[PDB]
Write a protein that binds this ligand. Structure first.
Ligand SMILES: [Mg+2]
Ligand SMILES: [Mg+2]
Ligand SMILES: [Mg+2]
Ligand SMILES: [Mg+2]
Ligand SMILES: [Mg+2]
Ligand SMILES: [Mg+2]
Ligand SMILES: [Mg+2]
Ligand SMILES: [Mg+2]
Ligand SMILES: [Mg+2]
Ligand SMILES: [Mg+2]
Ligand SMILES: [Mg+2]
Ligand SMILES: [Mg+2]
Ligand SMILES: [Mg+2]
Ligand SMILES: [Mg+2]
Ligand SMILES: [Mg+2]
Ligand SMILES: [Mg+2]
Ligand SMILES: [Mg+2]
Ligand SMILES: [Mg+2]
Ligand SMILES: [Mg+2]
Ligand SMILES: [Mg+2]
Ligand SMILES: [Mg+2]
Ligand SMILES: [Mg+2]
Ligand SMILES: [Mg+2]
Ligand SMILES: [Mg+2]
Ligand SMILES: [Mg+2]
Ligand SMILES: [Mg+2]
Ligand SMILES: [Mg+2]
Ligand SMILES: [Mg+2]
Ligand SMILES: [Mg+2]
Ligand SMILES: [Mg+2]
Ligand SMILES: [Mg+2]
Ligand SMILES: [Mg+2]
Ligand SMILES: [Mg+2]
Ligand SMILES: [Mg+2]
Ligand SMILES: [Mg+2]
Ligand SMILES: [Mg+2]
Ligand SMILES: [Mg+2]
Ligand SMILES: [Mg+2]
Ligand SMILES: [Mg+2]
Ligand SMILES: [Mg+2]
Ligand SMILES: [Mg+2]
Ligand SMILES: [Mg+2]
Ligand SMILES: [Mg+2]
Ligand SMILES: [Mg+2]
Ligand SMILES: [Mg+2]
Ligand SMILES: [Mg+2]
Ligand SMILES: [Mg+2]
Ligand SMILES: [Mg+2]
Ligand SMILES: [Mg+2]
Ligand SMILES: [Mg+2]
Ligand SMILES: [Mg+2]
Ligand SMILES: [Mg+2]
Ligand SMILES: [Mg+2]
Ligand SMILES: [Mg+2]
Ligand SMILES: [Mg+2]
Ligand SMILES: [Mg+2]
Ligand SMILES: [Mg+2]
Ligand SMILES: [Mg+2]
Ligand SMILES: [Mg+2]
Ligand SMILES: [Mg+2]
Ligand SMILES: [Mg+2]
Ligand SMILES: [Mg+2]
Ligand SMILES: [Mg+2]
Ligand SMILES: [Mg+2]
Ligand SMILES: [Mg+2]
Ligand SMILES: [Mg+2]
Ligand SMILES: [Mg+2]
Ligand SMILES: [Mg+2]
Ligand SMILES: [Mg+2]
Ligand SMILES: [Mg+2]
Ligand SMILES: [Mg+2]
Ligand SMILES: [Mg+2]
Ligand SMILES: [Mg+2]
Ligand SMILES: [Mg+2]
Ligand SMILES: [Mg+2]
Ligand SMILES: [Mg+2]
Ligand SMILES: [Mg+2]
Ligand SMILES: [Mg+2]
Ligand SMILES: [Mg+2]
Ligand SMILES: [Mg+2]
Ligand SMILES: [Mg+2]
Ligand SMILES: [Mg+2]
Ligand SMILES: [Mg+2]
Ligand SMILES: [Mg+2]
Ligand SMILES: [Mg+2]
Ligand SMILES: [Mg+2]
Ligand SMILES: [Mg+2]
Ligand SMILES: [Mg+2]
Ligand SMILES: [Mg+2]
Ligand SMILES: [Mg+2]
Ligand SMILES: [Mg+2]
Ligand SMILES: [Mg+2]
Ligand SMILES: [Mg+2]
Ligand SMILES: [Mg+2]
Ligand SMILES: [Mg+2]
Ligand SMILES: [Mg+2]
Ligand SMILES: [Mg+2]
Ligand SMILES: [Mg+2]
Ligand SMILES: [Mg+2]
Ligand SMILES: [Mg+2]
Ligand SMILES: [Mg+2]
Ligand SMILES: [Mg+2]
Ligand SMILES: [Mg+2]
Ligand SMILES: [Mg+2]
Ligand SMILES: [Mg+2]
Ligand SMILES: [Mg+2]
Lengths: 134, 130
RNA sequence: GGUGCAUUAGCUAGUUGGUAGGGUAAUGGCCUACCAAGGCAACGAUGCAUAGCCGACCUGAGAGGGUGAUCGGCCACACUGGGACUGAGACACGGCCCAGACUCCUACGGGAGGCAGCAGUAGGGAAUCUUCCGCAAUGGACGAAAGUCUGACGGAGCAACGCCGCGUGUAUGAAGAAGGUUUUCGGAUCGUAAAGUACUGUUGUUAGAGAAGAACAAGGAUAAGAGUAACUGCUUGUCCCUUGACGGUAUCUAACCAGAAAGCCACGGCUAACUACGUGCCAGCAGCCGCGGUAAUACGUAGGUGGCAAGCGUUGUCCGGAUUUAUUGGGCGUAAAGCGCGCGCAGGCGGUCUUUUAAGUCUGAUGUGAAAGCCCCCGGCUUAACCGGGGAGGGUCAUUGGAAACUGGAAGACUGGAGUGCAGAAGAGGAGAGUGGAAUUCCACGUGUAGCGGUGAAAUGCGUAGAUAUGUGGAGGAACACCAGUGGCGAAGGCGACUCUCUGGUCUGUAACUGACGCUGAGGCGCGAAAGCGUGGGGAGCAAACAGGAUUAGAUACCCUGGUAGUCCACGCCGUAAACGAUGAGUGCUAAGUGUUAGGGGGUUUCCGCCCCUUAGUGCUGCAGCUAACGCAUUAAGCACUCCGCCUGGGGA
RNA sequence: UCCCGGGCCUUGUACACACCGCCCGUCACACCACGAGAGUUUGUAACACCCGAAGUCGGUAGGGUAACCGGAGCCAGCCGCCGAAGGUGGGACAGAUAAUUGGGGUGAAGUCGUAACAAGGUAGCCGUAUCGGAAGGUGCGGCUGGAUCACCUCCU
RNA sequence: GGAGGAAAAAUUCU
RNA sequence: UAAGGAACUCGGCAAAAUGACCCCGUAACUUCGGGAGAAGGGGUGCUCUAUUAGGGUGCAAGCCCGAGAGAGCCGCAGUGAAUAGGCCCAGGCGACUGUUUAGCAAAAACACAGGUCUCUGCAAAACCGUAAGGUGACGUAUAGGGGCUGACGCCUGCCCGGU
């Protein structure tokens, strides 16, 4: 546009939304309100566990979980690794990262930071899955 | 209409692209100054001032090198009615890394980049030509 | 000078100004009485939401974008709200009074408290430290001084949290120890890597020497000054004596030791680095392309290799890449993107020349832009991190002196732009009234008899109560055959029979007249196909809805027979379209060839006619140039400038 | 000229698995987000009245009182203005929740049709009115972003 | 080749 | 009439409560007129400034009208007696004003402005009367009679075999 059109109204950017909203806020019990504080990991309480099916063309079953966070958010997380020691009413630590296979899952579970256990018989990539040196 | 200097530059640009040899247009003081400058740096070959009882006209002969090479390869307008540009003595630019020239109107008249930087004076830049 | 929203348009009344007065250190509706109705706001008032501000930090080629951790400067607060006293200075963190919530004591009358000070506890969190030493140094408060106080400060402890530095050995050691991994089972690989061999102690262990940070203050002598009648004392200068939490700390000296010291991620492409086994769309991997169904360099493991290193990976936030808001640095024919069009307020921009002004513009000098930080040059720590000195950078900053090309202001001058005048031309431009012929339908009457109409085939339907057909007459409504032509007019929608009345615009010819009077134009006002709405008429054809007959497996359709609203008129709404050239308006420049509409000039020619030149429209083919291409190309989608509108992945919408 | 099968050229295409293609909408099932909803509930900033502590200021002061010359002056006490908190009232704004309801979106083989892409078998699309289980049909006006185009007329 | 006007034919399905 | 305040009852029936003048302030909805006296609040006595500030009247004399402010004074209480709206939220019916069973029912019933159908060309149709004579009408289809519906807003679908 012309310079006069630019001085009359200036340019504007585009507001880009985040990918992991549940990590971007906390809860105040005194005010019973929600505040904008960004955190790398959070902790929550499990409600149910199960295994759902992916979209085409994949068909293998995947381990997921449903969690109430510190702010009472219904969050569907993914369980990595082989085997797990998770069940209802368990304390879990949720971490960023979404998987394309499941249309709703957007978060991962850290293995070895809370009630969650590590992975047995792991030699490679041992820093993740929370297995100590054998 | 609005800008006569831009019309000047566009006239030379069109005639240069067409490989025309002669160009004529109505005259003024600043037009004569620009033509005289271009003749001094040899971009054009010759310029004449023909007297007609409306305003007078200026006629410039475009200069081409051996084997039909264009001496003038581009003209760009810097200062515009919608956005004026003023340059300080230490902010005057070098056109085409010293290969071209710029025209600047300072308090001592119209000069080129070399003259403006030699006297440490500034003005408003009119155009680049290379 | 530094933020988001107009899906936040009015706000305000001690408010706005004045006349007197009170009050304060001081001016001031700061407060009072009187008088007038003012004041702010599309240059965003008022309101809602978020937020301490800056030097600065991260990123970036830069312009810019994000943030306000540590340190320095300013501001606000001290459990919540209000108030005053003392004082030079407070409406006062560890001062006072009142009310409020909470904690505690009570003999039930009543009292005490405020860690957002240094440590420390509980709770919230994914997440953050000792209930340590000393006034030795620097600085504070008190005092004449010694001296007291100082959780300021100087130090020690914890946490790989970050930057910098060093080590886990060094040389030699072979067709190649032994053993893993594979093998085309001859071999290759780990690999000079080992053992052996010769050497060192940076670290480490043992035993010892061991700084700077310290200047002092005060006390005793002195020497010289001012003051004095004389001293005492005072100011300066020179000596004597004394002072360490850190701390036996840094550092240094000797003896022993290869011994006590390496892990993480990755290896299909992006991207550096492959083999075997196991599994078989399962287990699973994953930032994307996507891998897994029996020969997996992508899943798990083993061997090997690559990167980094006391660190390595994962996640969260910011900048870059992203020209993906494009001033630097993008666009709108067909991919998202030109309002349906016009009249025009504010605003933006503006033909030529002269004189004058210095508002913009350019430049010199003065003051200032604290320290720390980036940068340059020097140094100090064994180097580095770190620390010190000097310098440089950074402003549309205030005072002031200069120049007058350009933009702006004033006074003049001129026609190219613009408009008027004078002479011609063309046209379905608009509104009102009247009239004309062809044809369809209906009605009446003569002639005449058995079918007519319709379809791919039929049937519904009309007809012996006499159709269809033909001839004569009458009634009424709507549309205007030939002319008719990528012809004409209008801003767009749009405008075709004829005559009259009232009116708008355009083109050419002249150079008479005025002398920049111009372009664009947010918000406003108006016009705007068809369908639709309200009131009153009119209704011949056609025809949404509707009914019947057909087709079809079904046929809420296409086809046939009828048919209401509507199509028409007047007044008033509505305000939309593939309202399209899918192309905003204004101006100028840039090869040609050939039709046509309305004019003008010249030459041939007695005229006619033919030829050439030119203005304004309307078609086609094509050069340079532009485009992703199709294509556009003097009626640009080419080359330039002014102004407006609009675009930023698809769906949801 | 016609019937049938081929071959070449040309044209339209939303097909490339290449028309045994592609592709639209309703209905039934599950899940998700959002709007409406008689109501309920939580909070924010104001406003208008009532009452109004501490405190400054102003007025009296019969009671008390050493400095000044019984008097002055001063204080206790009482009264008045302003005044935090509290109470009452009608509005404004913001969030949560609620029987039920409306369209929307996703979901390896559900049911019903075939609306669009070739002239898609009635050309398609846009505005509007009406009708229908659904895609959609029909009327009026406009466009070519339309295949074929016997015959007739202009342009290159 | 481009533009304008304009006749006659027509069953359903794959 | 102590304390309570609809617990009475078919039902707040009856009673109680508000009530005047001046000032502030006022919602959803709407046919833009309303709702509205919405709701909710504040002030009223006497004395002195004071034969007021100012007005009407008149030549003047004089006579009437009387708001704001200040200072005070007195009671439990100042429109000190009588007279003088209670208000709000939501739904059904009827648009509204009006009419009705003298003597049991006042309404959701009738009427109403508006809509539609149908008859009537003037000695009109319709109605009273045996007729004459009249109303309609001293009117003339924008007029007159009859049936149904009942402001206003959006609409009013299918069936003509039977009567
Ligand atoms: Mg892996
Ligand atoms: Mg700044
Ligand atoms: Mg900032
Ligand atoms: Mg004063
Ligand atoms: Mg804050
Ligand atoms: Mg830093
Ligand atoms: Mg960049
Ligand atoms: Mg910072
Ligand atoms: Mg801090
Ligand atoms: Mg600071
Ligand atoms: Mg505090
Ligand atoms: Mg606290
Ligand atoms: Mg004081
Ligand atoms: Mg203090
Ligand atoms: Mg404290
Ligand atoms: Mg503390
Ligand atoms: Mg704790
Ligand atoms: Mg000290
Ligand atoms: Mg000291
Ligand atoms: Mg102490
Ligand atoms: Mg400290
Ligand atoms: Mg310290
Ligand atoms: Mg830490
Ligand atoms: Mg470190
Ligand atoms: Mg290191
Ligand atoms: Mg070792
Ligand atoms: Mg060794
Ligand atoms: Mg060795
Ligand atoms: Mg082996
Ligand atoms: Mg070795
Ligand atoms: Mg020893
Ligand atoms: Mg020792
Ligand atoms: Mg030692
Ligand atoms: Mg001395
Ligand atoms: Mg001395
Ligand atoms: Mg000494
Ligand atoms: Mg001594
Ligand atoms: Mg001593
Ligand atoms: Mg000391
Ligand atoms: Mg010690
Ligand atoms: Mg010690
Ligand atoms: Mg040592
Ligand atoms: Mg030894
Ligand atoms: Mg030893
Ligand atoms: Mg050792
Ligand atoms: Mg050794
Ligand atoms: Mg060793
Ligand atoms: Mg180690
Ligand atoms: Mg692998
Ligand atoms: Mg390995
Ligand atoms: Mg390695
Ligand atoms: Mg950028
Ligand atoms: Mg740009
Ligand atoms: Mg773009
Ligand atoms: Mg454009
Ligand atoms: Mg488009
Ligand atoms: Mg247009
Ligand atoms: Mg459009
Ligand atoms: Mg327009
Ligand atoms: Mg203007
Ligand atoms: Mg000018
Ligand atoms: Mg500095
Ligand atoms: Mg600092
Ligand atoms: Mg050095
Ligand atoms: Mg430094
Ligand atoms: Mg330095
Ligand atoms: Mg320095
Ligand atoms: Mg510098
Ligand atoms: Mg001049
Ligand atoms: Mg002219
Ligand atoms: Mg006949
Ligand atoms: Mg003149
Ligand atoms: Mg407009
Ligand atoms: Mg119409
Ligand atoms: Mg109508
Ligand atoms: Mg039909
Ligand atoms: Mg539109
Ligand atoms: Mg358009
Ligand atoms: Mg243009
Ligand atoms: Mg032309
Ligand atoms: Mg062309
Ligand atoms: Mg283009
Ligand atoms: Mg063939
Ligand atoms: Mg052949
Ligand atoms: Mg072929
Ligand atoms: Mg083709
Ligand atoms: Mg139909
Ligand atoms: Mg059109
Ligand atoms: Mg054609
Ligand atoms: Mg009682
Ligand atoms: Mg009582
Ligand atoms: Mg009750
Ligand atoms: Mg009872
Ligand atoms: Mg009861
Ligand atoms: Mg009663
Ligand atoms: Mg009411
Ligand atoms: Mg009393
Ligand atoms: Mg009634
Ligand atoms: Mg009765
Ligand atoms: Mg009665
Ligand atoms: Mg009679
Ligand atoms: Mg009569
Ligand atoms: Mg009725
Ligand atoms: Mg009916
Ligand atoms: Mg019948
Ligand atoms: Mg019948």
């Amino acid at each position: 546009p012309t310079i006069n059109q630019l001085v009359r109204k200036p340019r504007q950017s585009k507001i880009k939304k985040s990918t992991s909203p549940a990590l971007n806020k906390g809860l105040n019990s005194f005010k019973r309100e929600l505040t904008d504080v960004n955190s790398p990991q959070k902790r929550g309480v499990c409600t149910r566990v199960g295994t759902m099916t992916p979209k085409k063309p994949n068909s293998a079953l995947r381990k997921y979980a449903r969690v109430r966070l510190s702010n009472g958010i219904e969050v569907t997380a993914y369980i990595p690794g082989i085997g797990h020691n998770l069940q209802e009413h368990s304390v879990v630590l949720i971490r960023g990262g979404r998987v394309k296979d499941l249309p709703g899952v957007r978060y991962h579970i850290v293995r070895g930071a809370l009630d969650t256990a590590g992975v047995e018989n792991r030699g490679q990539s041992r820093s993740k899955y929370g297995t100590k040196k054998p | 209409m609005t800008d006569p200097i831009a019309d000047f530059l566009t006239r030379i640009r069109n005639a240069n692209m067409v490989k025309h040899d002669k160009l004529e247009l109505p005259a003024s003081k600043i037009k004569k100054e620009i033509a005289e400058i271009l003749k001094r740096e040899g971009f054009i070959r010759d310029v004449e001032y023909i007297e007609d009882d409306n305003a007078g006209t200026i006629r410039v002969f475009l200069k081409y090198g051996a084997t039909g090479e264009r001496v003038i390869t581009g003209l760009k307008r810097i200062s515009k009615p919608g956005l004026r540009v003023y340059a300080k003595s230490t902010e005057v630019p070098k056109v085409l890394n010293g290969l071209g020239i710029a025209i600047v109107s300072t308090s001592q008249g119209v000069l080129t980049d070399k003259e403006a930087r030699a006297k440490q004076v500034g003005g408003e830049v009119l155009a680049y030509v290379w």
